Design an enzyme around this catalytic site. Structure first.
Site, short mmCIF file in Angstrom:
data_model
loop_
_atom_site.label_atom_id
_atom_site.label_comp_id
_atom_site.label_asym_id
_atom_site.label_seq_id
_atom_site.Cartn_x
_atom_site.Cartn_y
_atom_site.Cartn_z
CG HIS I 60 -1.88 1.19 1.27
ND1 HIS I 60 -2.68 1.51 0.24
CD2 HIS I 60 -2.08 1.98 2.11
CE1 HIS I 60 -3.45 2.68 0.63
NE2 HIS I 60 -2.92 2.84 1.93
CG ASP I 90 9.04 18.74 -28.88
OD1 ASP I 90 9.55 19.71 -28.81
OD2 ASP I 90 9.27 17.64 -29.56
CD1 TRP I 125 6.29 3.57 4.39
CD2 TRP I 125 7.60 4.46 2.83
NE1 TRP I 125 6.34 4.97 4.82
CE2 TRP I 125 7.26 5.46 3.76
CE3 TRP I 125 8.17 4.58 1.53
CZ2 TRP I 125 7.75 6.86 3.44
CZ3 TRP I 125 8.85 5.82 1.33
CH2 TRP I 125 8.58 6.92 2.41
CB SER I 152 11.42 5.97 -14.36
OG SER I 152 11.00 5.95 -13.04
CB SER I 153 12.28 9.35 -10.32
OG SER I 153 13.44 8.46 -9.79
CG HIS I 228 11.38 15.60 5.44
ND1 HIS I 228 10.07 15.50 5.99
CD2 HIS I 228 11.69 16.77 5.00
CE1 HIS I 228 9.69 16.90 5.98
NE2 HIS I 228 10.58 17.62 5.56
CD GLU I 230 9.42 10.63 -3.05
OE1 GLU I 230 10.53 10.90 -3.59
OE2 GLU I 230 8.46 10.33 -3.80
CE1 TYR I 232 7.55 20.36 2.87
CE2 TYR I 232 9.37 18.59 3.61
CZ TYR I 232 8.44 19.69 3.92
OH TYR I 232 8.26 20.00 5.31
CB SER I 243 -0.19 28.63 -7.55
OG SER I 243 0.56 28.02 -8.69
CG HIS I 277 11.27 15.18 10.93
ND1 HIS I 277 10.42 14.18 10.64
CD2 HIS I 277 11.31 16.26 10.06
CE1 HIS I 277 10.09 14.63 9.52
NE2 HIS I 277 10.52 15.41 9.07
CG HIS I 278 10.90 10.92 9.26
ND1 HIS I 278 9.77 10.11 9.32
CD2 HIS I 278 11.04 11.77 8.13
CE1 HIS I 278 8.98 10.95 8.10
NE2 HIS I 278 9.71 11.92 7.82
CB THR I 303 4.94 25.61 4.73
OG1 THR I 303 5.94 24.88 4.23
CG2 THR I 303 3.54 24.99 4.28
CE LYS I 306 4.25 28.15 -2.83
NZ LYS I 306 2.70 28.63 -3.12
NE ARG I 428 2.88 4.36 11.16
CZ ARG I 428 3.69 5.02 10.15
NH1 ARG I 428 4.16 6.33 10.62
NH2 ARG I 428 3.86 4.52 8.96
C1 HEA Z 1 3.38 15.29 1.59
C2 HEA Z 1 3.45 14.63 2.62
C3 HEA Z 1 3.90 15.53 3.62
C4 HEA Z 1 4.04 17.10 4.12
C5 HEA Z 1 3.85 18.19 3.66
C6 HEA Z 1 4.70 16.97 5.55
C7 HEA Z 1 4.99 17.79 6.12
C8 HEA Z 1 5.57 17.89 7.68
N1 HEA Z 1 5.83 16.90 8.10
FE1 HEA Z 1 5.61 14.93 7.72
N2 HEA Z 1 5.57 12.98 7.27
C9 HEA Z 1 4.73 12.67 6.11
C10 HEA Z 1 4.37 13.28 5.19
C11 HEA Z 1 4.41 14.64 4.93
N3 HEA Z 1 4.80 15.53 6.15
C12 HEA Z 1 4.72 10.91 6.13
C13 HEA Z 1 4.26 10.35 4.83
C14 HEA Z 1 5.53 10.50 7.31
C15 HEA Z 1 5.58 9.20 7.87
C16 HEA Z 1 6.47 8.50 7.16
C17 HEA Z 1 6.76 7.10 7.97
O1 HEA Z 1 6.98 7.56 9.04
O2 HEA Z 1 6.62 5.86 7.59
C18 HEA Z 1 5.58 12.09 7.88
C19 HEA Z 1 6.04 12.03 9.17
C20 HEA Z 1 6.55 12.96 10.04
C21 HEA Z 1 6.96 12.95 11.35
C22 HEA Z 1 7.42 11.81 12.14
C23 HEA Z 1 6.51 11.58 13.36
C24 HEA Z 1 6.86 10.12 13.94
O3 HEA Z 1 7.76 9.54 13.33
O4 HEA Z 1 6.56 10.15 15.02
C25 HEA Z 1 7.02 14.41 11.50
C26 HEA Z 1 7.97 14.98 12.95
O5 HEA Z 1 8.66 15.56 12.71
C27 HEA Z 1 6.77 15.26 10.44
C28 HEA Z 1 6.82 16.64 10.41
C29 HEA Z 1 6.39 17.25 9.40
C30 HEA Z 1 6.18 18.82 9.45
C31 HEA Z 1 6.76 19.38 10.75
C32 HEA Z 1 5.80 19.33 8.26
C33 HEA Z 1 5.59 20.61 7.50
O6 HEA Z 1 5.88 20.47 6.23
C34 HEA Z 1 3.97 21.09 7.83
C35 HEA Z 1 4.00 22.66 7.44
C36 HEA Z 1 2.90 23.09 7.40
C37 HEA Z 1 2.37 23.75 8.41
C38 HEA Z 1 2.94 24.07 9.55
C39 HEA Z 1 0.74 24.32 8.12
C40 HEA Z 1 0.77 25.44 7.11
C41 HEA Z 1 1.65 26.62 7.73
C42 HEA Z 1 1.08 27.72 8.32
C43 HEA Z 1 -0.53 27.75 8.54
C44 HEA Z 1 1.65 28.72 9.07
C45 HEA Z 1 1.39 28.93 10.75
C46 HEA Z 1 1.83 27.67 11.47
C47 HEA Z 1 2.91 27.83 11.99
C48 HEA Z 1 3.59 29.09 12.39
C49 HEA Z 1 3.09 26.70 12.95
N4 HEA Z 1 6.26 14.39 9.60
C1 HEA Z 2 -0.16 8.85 -1.04
C2 HEA Z 2 -0.40 7.78 -0.74
C3 HEA Z 2 -1.27 7.26 -0.03
C4 HEA Z 2 -2.77 7.32 -0.31
C5 HEA Z 2 -3.84 7.90 -1.44
C6 HEA Z 2 -3.52 6.30 0.59
C7 HEA Z 2 -4.70 6.01 0.82
C8 HEA Z 2 -5.30 5.71 1.91
N1 HEA Z 2 -4.73 4.92 3.01
FE1 HEA Z 2 -2.84 4.87 3.29
N2 HEA Z 2 -0.78 4.87 3.73
C9 HEA Z 2 0.00 5.51 2.89
C10 HEA Z 2 0.12 6.04 1.81
C11 HEA Z 2 -1.39 6.39 1.19
N3 HEA Z 2 -2.39 6.15 1.76
C12 HEA Z 2 1.31 5.03 3.43
C13 HEA Z 2 2.67 5.71 2.67
C14 HEA Z 2 1.09 4.36 4.61
C15 HEA Z 2 2.26 3.70 5.51
C16 HEA Z 2 2.76 2.34 5.02
C17 HEA Z 2 3.36 1.64 6.16
O1 HEA Z 2 2.75 1.69 7.35
O2 HEA Z 2 4.40 0.88 5.88
C18 HEA Z 2 -0.09 4.16 4.73
C19 HEA Z 2 -0.88 3.59 5.59
C20 HEA Z 2 -2.31 3.48 5.86
C21 HEA Z 2 -2.65 2.52 6.93
C22 HEA Z 2 -2.23 1.98 8.00
C23 HEA Z 2 -1.91 0.31 7.61
C24 HEA Z 2 -0.75 0.14 8.98
O3 HEA Z 2 0.24 -0.06 8.83
O4 HEA Z 2 -1.24 -0.56 10.10
C25 HEA Z 2 -4.15 2.60 6.18
C26 HEA Z 2 -5.35 2.00 7.33
O5 HEA Z 2 -5.49 2.69 8.45
C27 HEA Z 2 -4.12 3.37 5.39
C28 HEA Z 2 -5.38 3.67 4.81
C29 HEA Z 2 -5.70 4.52 3.78
C30 HEA Z 2 -6.95 4.52 3.14
C31 HEA Z 2 -8.02 4.07 3.90
C32 HEA Z 2 -6.66 5.54 2.13
C33 HEA Z 2 -7.69 6.08 0.93
O6 HEA Z 2 -8.28 4.76 0.29
C34 HEA Z 2 -8.90 7.07 1.56
C35 HEA Z 2 -9.80 7.30 0.38
C36 HEA Z 2 -9.29 8.07 -1.04
C37 HEA Z 2 -9.28 7.59 -1.86
C38 HEA Z 2 -9.96 6.24 -2.28
C39 HEA Z 2 -9.07 8.21 -3.14
C40 HEA Z 2 -7.43 7.68 -3.52
C41 HEA Z 2 -7.39 7.86 -5.28
C42 HEA Z 2 -6.36 7.84 -5.73
C43 HEA Z 2 -4.98 7.65 -4.76
C44 HEA Z 2 -5.96 7.98 -7.16
C45 HEA Z 2 -5.80 9.24 -7.61
C46 HEA Z 2 -5.34 9.23 -9.15
C47 HEA Z 2 -5.60 10.35 -10.07
C48 HEA Z 2 -6.41 11.75 -9.24
C49 HEA Z 2 -5.48 10.26 -11.27
N4 HEA Z 2 -3.24 3.99 4.91
O1 LIG Z 3 8.17 13.56 6.73
O2 LIG Z 3 7.62 14.89 6.96
CU LIG Z 4 9.92 14.01 7.38
#
Ligand code: HEA
Ligand code: HEA
Ligand SMILES: [O-][O-]
Ligand SMILES: [Cu+2]
Ligand SMILES: CCCCCCCCCCCCCCCCCC(=O)OC[C@H](COP(=O)([O-])OCC(O)COP(=O)([O-])OC[C@@H](COC(=O)CCCCCCCCCCCCCCCCC)OC(=O)CCCCCCCCCCCCCCCCC)OC(=O)CCCCCCCCCCCCCCCCC
Ligand SMILES: CCCCCCCCCCCCCCCCCC(=O)OC[C@H](COP(=O)([O-])OCC(O)COP(=O)([O-])OC[C@@H](COC(=O)CCCCCCCCCCCCCCCCC)OC(=O)CCCCCCCCCCCCCCCCC)OC(=O)CCCCCCCCCCCCCCCCC
Ligand SMILES: CCCCCCCCCCCCCCCCCC(=O)OC[C@H](COP(=O)([O-])OCC(O)COP(=O)([O-])OC[C@@H](COC(=O)CCCCCCCCCCCCCCCCC)OC(=O)CCCCCCCCCCCCCCCCC)OC(=O)CCCCCCCCCCCCCCCCC
Ligand SMILES: CCCCCCCCCCCCCCCCCC(=O)OC[C@H](COP(=O)([O-])OCC(O)COP(=O)([O-])OC[C@@H](COC(=O)CCCCCCCCCCCCCCCCC)OC(=O)CCCCCCCCCCCCCCCCC)OC(=O)CCCCCCCCCCCCCCCCC
Ligand SMILES: CCCCCCCC/C=C/CCCCCCCC(=O)OC[C@H](COP(=O)(O)OCCN)OC(=O)CCCCCCC/C=C/CCCCCCCC
Ligand SMILES: CCCCCCCC/C=C\CCCCCCCC(=O)OC[C@H](COP(=O)(O)OCCN)OC(=O)CCCCCCC/C=C\CCCCCCCC
Ligand SMILES: [K+]
Ligand SMILES: [Zn+2]
Ligand SMILES: [Zn+2]
Lengths: 47, 180, 121, 99, 91, 90, 107, 186, 459
Positions: I60, I90, I125, I152-153, I228, I230, I232, I243, I277-278, I303, I306, I428
């Protein structure tokens, strides 16, 4: 100690160490700031 | 009024599911025999021979378009001399009723208006400053708390007892000093 | 206050009512809304107001509902979402009676404060 | 009612807006120029004048915090002292202790 | 449901001949959507979800009554002592 | 310039801001030096900052302290409210 | 920041006392899904699609100039749906400056 | 920002100036094919990026972040007892690494750790001074702060003398209570 | 032809098509997870087949990240509009563009084939060793897929970077969004490849990096040094889309274009230096923890700028324009949803809060709100905006208020309860759990089945 049904436990619950209390209060300290950040921004999402 | 009734006549309901008869009743896969349609199938789609098997990009049916003088056919403008001046009349697209169907009447009025721009440079600059530095202040407000709590976890404490914990698949081993 | 203090070249309506008009409307029918506040068939153009006569920059405002139902319509003639109502009638009233506006706002805020505090506390 | 109209007329007179101090470099409208646009132009939001906005916004702030106080003093109650903590006998055995 | 004709704050501005155009109505009509039964069902539906979202459905309560009476007896007889208003809650 | 609207910097200090490219470089350098200095002058300095007998007591500290001292609140606040675990059961 | 073009008061003075703002409708019309005729083949349906392009439409003003369909980005300038080859003639981004040279003029 | 190419742009002397930027901006540019066009494009970029007030805020943020980053890297290499770049001590068994053990205690007591540890009473309600006393002496003895941490700690009184229950929750009163029962030493 | 086509716009369509196909497998796995978690007990997976659940969660995550959202937001919309936005005929590298999509498909086939043929086991994953290196051959197959995907990426990143050399117009914010993601890929991918090769060496070449005297924490550093960046690389293209949509639909010029651009650049630099932070709970040094916590909180500044610049784009827009279009609703919903995800990110950024919330479903809900809700909706909104240009039909989406409302409500029913169980706490990557966590897990499960049903109404 143990999870209980249908509990929010926002920020944590039932600490039994000084560090555990610290963790709960750190979350509680920041929570109002998070609400402010959300409310203040969402209120302006409109035409 | 109902605008659909205006162009109801043009829309004759269909007879075949997906708009094609069974291939047995008519073979739409074959190339059309009509003169000038050798590149099309019977149903009008492009034939595989034209697009794949004998695609011109692969060297089939080589026919350079440009002539000896380096020229290609170009259609001229609609020129109309008048009032001692040569004018060009532009091509206006057909009425949207012809292409879309609805009758072009009772159109709601959307006036011309120049772009909606934010004014008052001084005010805008201050807002942009706040858009950046209000978050900066909040971060600074968390910074001191973050340092303190980090220092608290990593504090040299006068511990008097030790418990060793080993994690194995799938159980936890515990080693503890035995009373003397 | 755009027409009042900022810009003097847009038509300025008269307030027919500081409250919206409730009307039942039907999908597929076009309605014409009075933008001058002088029509006697409010909220619609009556054929005798400024809008109907195209006088002084006043024109009828075309409107059409997507679905059948009861919709609120602007009486103050300045709502941002005109012809529909969005609360601008109350806002424009506060501009005209600022003392009354404070009373209502205090009362509304008082109720909101009590309820939110009572539930969270 | 006489005092009501008096304060209503007193507030109204003080709040009447003065011409804005434009923060933009616009021309002066030619003299004698009337209404040129029409009501079908995209609607421009009706905005309160600064004084009126402060008055009503301040009334709202005074209202919400007075409402918070009303709820705290009338609707809600204070914690009574905790019950006395007396010595109580614990259960003899853990329910899961082998016999 | 043959709604009434509300003249409004200024009755002279509603004194003209409407003809086919709809006449203004009381605000209760807007809240009831002209007493449309489906909108009433939809309104009751809106309350039903929101109650589920915040406090739970509370439609399972009649079914859970016997099993909530057994849980309450167990907590009182064998659970940790509850004091004052705490005795109202059973988990 | 720290926490400074640069529109103000452009207006009040026109000659210092004439070269905007150079102005940008100074912005980066100044804040780079600030970050570097914080680590090695506020965090790093060893065996420093442990003078807990010198806790700063601001003018507001004393205003509030004297107010409570004048009344009995300061004495009452500092008094230990309970130093026993169990109440006596009558 | 952009706040519109600057206007001098002299340019706001009318040549007649009845001049008002022109009330020309900038709604292009009523549209829906492009409706192809069954009789038309693939080639003739392509012509139909090319004749239904909103970005080829404009509004003619009282003086004969036309304000075209405009967009912030060039994504809205290609035929819809996008053809295989779009910008054969390079789109021209027009910049304006005050520089001039004598060769362009004649006395 | 001038709008006529005839009017020169002021430049300071140095390695980051208007002249320095002009020399290098068009090095890889296919669009700056003649002086007039090159200058027009150069001023267009300078106007857009360097005369934009909000852009300077990001310049501050990158400098601050990078300065912290460079310094934390350097500090680890220069002072952290566990980072080895020289090999003398790595060619000896652990008991013999005296030169590396010299970094240990100085590194264990940074200034900010001494300055901020007393403020744990703004995060802990019960026995915030539970870990203050340590008879060994590797770290200083800790004294609780007299004021709340500045910022978002509105839930606690500004000064702890204002709090009624603060003194009764101290590890000293708790020790008194439990020692009176014979329950525990601490 | 079909497979031979080099047209950049055709290839863009292929990327979206393949993302939806592979997405079906992704959603199915998500349904399996939520069904299992509906109560305590075994529901659809036997206790003797618990290894399958571990594989389900692993696949998943990997598929949704690398085979669905990344190919959709960085391969699909980019390959279709970027050359048009750049007023160029193109894409610069036609043949490379063709092979990139073929590579993605081939790596997908390898992964799914490994499900069918190999023993089904999982290691997350994040493929943490030593667990990843003591597994069966399915782990080897997954590694091959990732390495192939990496090829590919990187080549696609090279392709986009070359637009700077040919762009004939102005670099719009969206173009800046893709360029910076390309830079992030060029700098992060080579590090990932190295650590993946070391995983292979221990799996297949008798290497000893991840056995005693070798530090397993080493992998986490190199992995998350790509990890991380990734997240972003997956969000920045979404920001670029938001935008364009807001400016176009509201007929308002982007406000603070240069601040938007400089905010994207800033997020990238900062995102390249905050990876640990992970790794808060591993036991890193106090100063390291403080550095990473400090820099992680800084990312909110750019962030945040924006977000507020987007809000003013929607403010003040003409009322006459109909605002119920699905693309506009999705763009607005992104702001509302992203703030929730980001704020929770800042909460978890505090390491002491993180001790309680690491490896709990609070982290799940955090990154779902950003990806499963925010990124998905952004891709949908972008495709919807380009419906006329792309030309697809046979769906009822463009004006469907029911779909938007139902999606928003039900998606929140799934992940909002996952924040609650994070303080319960429910770890989890588990399938069985204590009976006192059923309520919230059940509510989220009801949300998952409902969302799937709403996906059928579009056709
Ligand atoms: C695209 C996906 C995405 C994005 C944008 C982010 C954004 C951020 N993530 Fe991420 N993060 C994940 C995807 C993402 N993350 C995933 C997938 C994991 C788990 C991976 C795994 O463990 O397997 C993860 C895990 C993860 C952890 C791990 C927690 C743990 O392992 O127990 C933490 C903690 O530091 C973290 C922090 C953040 C922070 C601080 C931001 C910042 O970018 C957020 C910034 C945005 C805001 C802050 C809000 C908008 C800003 C404002 C409204 C301004 C005013 C706000 C303030 C002044 C605070 N992320
Ligand atoms: C972007 C990536 C992505 C997306 C879309 C989702 C979508 C969803 N995920 Fe996600 N999920 C992950 C990334 C994602 N997840 C990752 C990275 C983990 C951690 C893996 C790990 O633990 O090792 C995770 C873990 C995770 C768990 C934890 C299982 C566990 O480890 O114990 C669960 C269930 O609770 C869950 C549920 C769901 C559900 C219910 C939806 C969605 O079904 C919710 C409903 C939304 C939709 C059905 C729309 C989705 C449609 C598309 C994605 C297609 C878009 C295409 C076009 C627009 C062209 N996810
Ligand atoms: O990963 O934030
Ligand atoms: Cu991170
Ligand atoms: C007197 C009345 C007020 C009483 C109370 C006052 C209290 C003091 C406030 C300060 C002083 C006020 C003074 C005002 C005086 C008037 C000034 C003036 O100019 O008047 C004319 C002016 C309007 O005049 P006009 O523009 O000419 O036109 C008239 C129109 O009416 C045009 O009107 P408008 O456009 O201005 O309409 C207002 C509308 C404008 O705004 C909107 O409509 C925006 C709505 C966007 C919604 C987007 C969707 C959000 C869905 C999110 C779901 C998330 C689920 C998952 C969560 C997971 C979490 C883990 O406001 C709202 O709808 C309120 C939005 C507030 C924020 C919403 C978010 C709350 C979050 C709560 C915490 C959540 C925590 C968990 C989440 C995560 C946290 C990190 O009037 C106003 O300004 C009115 C403002 C009214 C505000 C009311 C707020 C009520 C809601 C409170 C929050 C909800 C919870 C409450 C418990
Ligand atoms: C007791 C009652 C006392 C009543 C005092 C009333 C004073 C007053 O309103 O003076 C206005 C009065 C104007 O009277 P007027 O006859 O209506 O003249 C208006 C003219 O048309 C033209 O006047 P002008 O050209 O001189 O310019 C005046 C105009 C120029 O306005 C502007 O340029 C705009 C000003 C507002 C900009 C705000 C920008 C915020 C940007 C935020 C960005 C970040 C957002 C995201 C944050 C994220 C964080 C995480 O000023 C305003 O509009 C001011 C509006 C009020 C600003 C209040 C700021 C603080 C908040 C206060 C809330 C209410 C508290 C009530 C407390 C009650 C007790 C509990 O001004 C003066 O007399 C001198 C100025
Ligand atoms: C459950 C059963 C169903 C209940 C339905 C409730 C719907 C509520 C939300 C409606 C949409 C809200 C909205 O944004 O309206 C835009 C609308 C702007 O113009 P519009 O053209 O009327 O709305 C077009 C929308 O697309 C309107 O959406 P649409 O295209 O679907 O058309 C539906 C139409 C017709 O819908 C209705 O007739 C809804 C009637 C709801 C009765 C609820 C009874 C209790 C149910 C439980 O709705 C309206 O006319 C909007 C009425 C909004 C106010 C509702 C009453 C609030 C309490 C007074 O805003 C308003 O009129 C409301 C502004 C209120 C003041 C806000 C700030 C206050 C701050 C101080 C406190
Ligand atoms: C003793 C031994 C000694 C040693 C000997 C050593 C010998 C060494 C030999 C070395 C070389 C060997 C290899 C030679 C390759 C030659 C390539 C070449 O030059 O071909 C020219 C040749 C040109 O053909 P042509 O002779 O001019 O005429 C072709 C026809 O007229 C047709 O014209 P067309 O090309 O326009 O039509 C193509 C197209 C026509 O389109 C359609 O069929 C309908 C439209 C599409 C329908 C929707 C499909 C789903 C959406 C996909 C979206 C993404 C597409 C991306 C682009 C396509 C990528 C394939 O359909 C297809 O053929 C494929 C469509 C896409 C299929 C995959 C879609 C996803 C399915 C996922 C299912 C599971 C989940 O290329 C082709 O047309 C065929 C190439 C076939 C390559 C197949 C490779 C498959 C690899 C699969 C994975 C392998 C591992 C696992 C397998 C497990 C099996 C159990
Ligand atoms: C070209 C002519 C020939 C040159 C030949 C050079 C041969 C040797 C080169 C070796 C690699 C370069 C570093 C040389 C260091 C020499 C001095 C030395 O031994 O330093 C040791 C010292 C620590 O030694 P220990 O005592 O074992 O540890 C005690 C507890 N921490 O290590 C160092 O200072 C060297 C390692 C760090 C080098 C880089 C400086 C540190 C900061 C890096 C910052 C990176 C971020 C970006 C910075 C940008 C610019 C500000
Ligand atoms: C205007 C700004 C300054 C206002 C005044 C500040 C001031 O003087 O604060 C003093 C006050 C101490 O006062 P008392 O506790 O009362 O007395 C000391 C008793 N032992 O200091 C504080 O509160 C602490 C201030 C800390 C500033 C920290 C700056 C940043 C340092 C680095 C942070 C981490 C960077 C990244 C990791 C680096 C790892 C090496
Ligand atoms: K289960
Ligand atoms: Zn009228
Ligand atoms: Zn109104």
């Amino acid at each position: 100690d143990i999870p209980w049904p249908a509990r929010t436990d926002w920020g944590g619950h039932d600490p039994a160490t000084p560090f555990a209390e610290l963790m709960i209060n750190t979350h509680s300290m920041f929570w109002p700031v998070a609400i402010f950040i959300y409310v203040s921004a969402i209120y302006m999402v409109k035409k | 009024k109902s605008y659909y009734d205006d162009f109801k006549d043009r829309l004759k309901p269909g007879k075949y599911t997906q708009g094609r008869c069974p291939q047995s009743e008519g073979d739409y896969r074959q190339e059309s025999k009509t003169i000038g349609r050798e590149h099309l199938n019977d149903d009008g789609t492009r034939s595989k021979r034209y697009t794949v098997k004998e695609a011109d990009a692969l060297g089939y049916h080589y026919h350079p378009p440009i002539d000896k003088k380096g020229q290609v056919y170009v259609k001229g403008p609609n020129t109309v001399i008048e009032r001692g001046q040569t004018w060009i009349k532009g091509y206006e697209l057909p009425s949207m009723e012809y292409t879309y169907g609805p009758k072009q009447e009772d159109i709601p009025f959307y006036p011309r208006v120049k772009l909606n721009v934010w004014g008052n440079y001084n005010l805008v600059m201050k807002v942009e400053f706040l858009f950046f530095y209000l978050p900066t202040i909040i971060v600074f407000g968390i910074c001191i708390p973050v340092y303190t709590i980090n220092f608290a976890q990593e504090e040299v404490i006068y511990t008097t007892m030790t418990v060793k914990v080993t994690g194995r698949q799938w159980y936890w081993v515990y080693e503890v000093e035995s009373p003397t | 206050t755009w027409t009042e203090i900022w810009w003097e070249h847009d038509p300025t309506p008269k307030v027919a009512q500081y409250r919206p008009y409730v009307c039942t409307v039907e999908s597929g029918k076009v309605y014409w809304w009075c933008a001058c506040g002088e029509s006697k068939t409010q909220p619609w153009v009556d054929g005798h107001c400024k809008c109907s006569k195209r006088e002084g920059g006043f024109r009828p405002r075309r409107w059409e509902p997507e679905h059948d139902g009861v919709r609120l319509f602007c009486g103050c003639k300045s709502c941002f979402s005109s012809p529909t109502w969005n609360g601008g009638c109350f806002t424009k009233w506060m501009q005209s009676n600022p003392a009354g506006g404070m009373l209502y706002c205090f009362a509304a805020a008082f109720g909101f404060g009590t309820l939110t505090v009572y539930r969270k506390f | 009612a006489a005092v009501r109209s008096q304060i209503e007329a007193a507030v109204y007179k003080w709040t009447r807006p003065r011409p804005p101090r434009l923060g933009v470099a616009v021309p002066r409208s030619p003299p004698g120029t009337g209404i040129l646009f029409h009501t079908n132009m995209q609607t421009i939001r009706y905005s309160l004048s600064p004084k009126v906005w402060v008055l009503v916004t301040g009334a709202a702030l005074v209202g919400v915090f007075s409402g918070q106080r009303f709820a705290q003093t009338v609707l809600l109650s204070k914690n009574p002292p905790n019950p006395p903590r007396y010595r109580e006998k614990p259960p003899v055995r853990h329910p899961h202790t082998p016999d | 449901y043959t709604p009434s004709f509300e003249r409004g704050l200024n009755p002279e501005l509603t004194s003209g001949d409407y003809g086919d155009m709809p006449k203004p109505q009381p605000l209760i009509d807007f809240f009831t959507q002209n007493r449309n039964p489906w909108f009433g069902f939809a309104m009751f539906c809106g309350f039903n979800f929101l109650w589920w979202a915040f406090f739970g459905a509370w439609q399972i309560r009649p079914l859970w009554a016997s099993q909530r009476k057994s849980l309450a007896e167990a907590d009182r007889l064998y659970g940790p002592t509850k004091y004052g208003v705490g005795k109202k809650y059973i988990n | 310039s720290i926490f400074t609207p640069m529109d103000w910097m452009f207006y009040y200090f026109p000659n210092y801001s004439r070269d905007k490219v150079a102005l940008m470089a100074r912005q980066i350098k100044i804040h780079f030096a600030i970050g570097f200095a914080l680590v090695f002058l506020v965090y790093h300095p060893p065996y420093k900052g442990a003078d807990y007998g010198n806790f700063h007591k601001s003018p507001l500290y004393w205003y509030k302290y004297n107010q409570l001292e004048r009344s009995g609140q300061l004495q009452e606040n500092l008094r230990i409210k309970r130093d026993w675990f169990y109440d006596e059961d009558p | 920041i952009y706040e519109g073009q600057t206007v001098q008061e002299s340019e706001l003075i009318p040549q007649e006392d009845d001049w008002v703002i022109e009330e020309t409708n900038f709604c292009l019309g009523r549209n829906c899904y492009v409706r192809f005729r069954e009789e038309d083949d693939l080639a003739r349906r392509a012509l139909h699609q090319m004749d239904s392009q909103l970005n080829k439409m404009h509004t003619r003003l009282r003086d004969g100039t036309v304000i075209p369909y405009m967009s912030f980005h060039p994504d809205e300038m290609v035929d819809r749906p996008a053809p295989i080859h779009t910008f054969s003639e390079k789109p021209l981004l027009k910049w304006t400056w005050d520089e001039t040279y004598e060769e362009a003029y004649d006395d | 920002p001038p709008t006529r190419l005839s009017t020169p742009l002021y430049s300071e002397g140095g390695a980051f100036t208007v002249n320095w930027w002009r020399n290098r901006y068009g090095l890889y540019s296919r669009r700056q094919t003649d002086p007039m066009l090159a200058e027009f494009l150069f001023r267009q970029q300078v106007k857009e990026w360097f005369y934009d007030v909000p852009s300077y805020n990001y310049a501050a943020l990158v400098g601050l972040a990078l300065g912290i980053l460079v310094a934390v890297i350097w500090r680890h290499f220069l002072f952290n007892p566990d980072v080895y770049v020289r090999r003398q001590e790595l060619r000896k068994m652990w008991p013999d690494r005296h030169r590396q053990f010299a970094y240990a205690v100085p590194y264990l007591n940074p200034q900010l750790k001494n300055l901020l540890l007393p403020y744990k009473n703004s995060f802990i309600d019960n026995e915030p001074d539970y870990a203050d006393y340590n008879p060994v002496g590797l770290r200083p003895q800790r004294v609780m702060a007299i004021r709340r941490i500045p910022g978002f700690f509105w839930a606690i009184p500004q000064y702890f003398f204002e709090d009624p229950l603060y003194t009764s929750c101290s590890t000293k009163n708790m020790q008194t209570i439990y020692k009176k029962l014979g329950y525990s030493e601490l | 032809f079909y497979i031979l086509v080099n047209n950049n716009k055709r290839i863009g369509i292929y990327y979206i098509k393949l993302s939806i196909i592979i997405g079906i497998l992704g959603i199915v796995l998500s349904y399996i997870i939520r069904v299992e978690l509906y109560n305590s007990g075994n529901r659809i997976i036997k206790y003797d087949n618990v290894n399958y659940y571990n594989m389900v969660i692993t696949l998943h995550g990997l598929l949704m990240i690398f085979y669905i959202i990344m190919p959709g937001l960085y391969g699909g919309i980019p390959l279709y509009i970027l050359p048009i936005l750049s007023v160029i005929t193109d894409i610069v590298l036609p043949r490379i563009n063709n092979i990139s999509i073929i590579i993605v498909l081939i790596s997908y086939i390898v992964v799914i084939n490994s499900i069918v043929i190999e023993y089904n086991i999982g290691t997350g994953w994040t493929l943490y060793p030593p667990l990843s290196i003591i597994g069966t051959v399915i782990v080897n197959m997954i590694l091959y897929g990732l390495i192939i995907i990496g090829i590919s990426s990187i080549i696609s990143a090279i392709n986009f970077m070359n637009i700077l050399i040919v762009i004939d117009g102005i670099i719009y914010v969206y173009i800046w969004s893709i360029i910076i993601t390309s830079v992030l890929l060029i700098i992060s991918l080579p590090i990932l490849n190295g650590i993946l090769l070391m995983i292979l060496s221990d799996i297949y070449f008798n290497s000893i990096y991840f056995i005693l005297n070798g530090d397993v924490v080493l992998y986490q550093h190199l992995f998350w040094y790509f990890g991380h960046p990734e997240v972003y690389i997956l969000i920045l293209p979404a920001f670029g889309i938001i935008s364009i949509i807001l400016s176009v639909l509201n007929n308002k010029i982007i406000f603070g274009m240069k601040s938007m651009i400089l905010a994207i650049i800033m997020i990238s630099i900062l995102g390249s230096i905050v990876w640990a932070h992970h790794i808060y709970t591993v036991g890193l040094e106090l100063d390291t923890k403080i550095y990473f916590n400090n820099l992680t909180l800084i990312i909110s500044i750019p962030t945040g700028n924006k977000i507020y610049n987007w809000i003013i784009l929607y403010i003040g827009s003409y009322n006459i324009l109909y605002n119920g279009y699905q693309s506009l609703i999705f763009s607005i919903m992104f702001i509302i949803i992203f703030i929730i995800g980001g704020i929770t990110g800042i909460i978890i950024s505090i390491d002491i809060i993180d001790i309680g919330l690491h490896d709990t479903y609070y982290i799940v809900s955090h990154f779902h709100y950003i990806l499963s809700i925010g990124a998905v909706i952004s891709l949908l909104a972008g495709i919807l905006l380009l419906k006329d240009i792309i030309g697809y039909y046979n769906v009822i989406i463009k004006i469907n208020k029911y779909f938007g409302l139902l999606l928003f409500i039900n998606i929140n029913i799934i992940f909002t309860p996952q924040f609650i169980i994070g303080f319960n706490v429910m770890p989890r990557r588990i399938l069985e759990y204590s009976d006192n966590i059923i309520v919230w897990n059940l509510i989220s499960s009801i949300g998952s089945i409902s969302t799937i049903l709403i996906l059928l109404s579009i056709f």
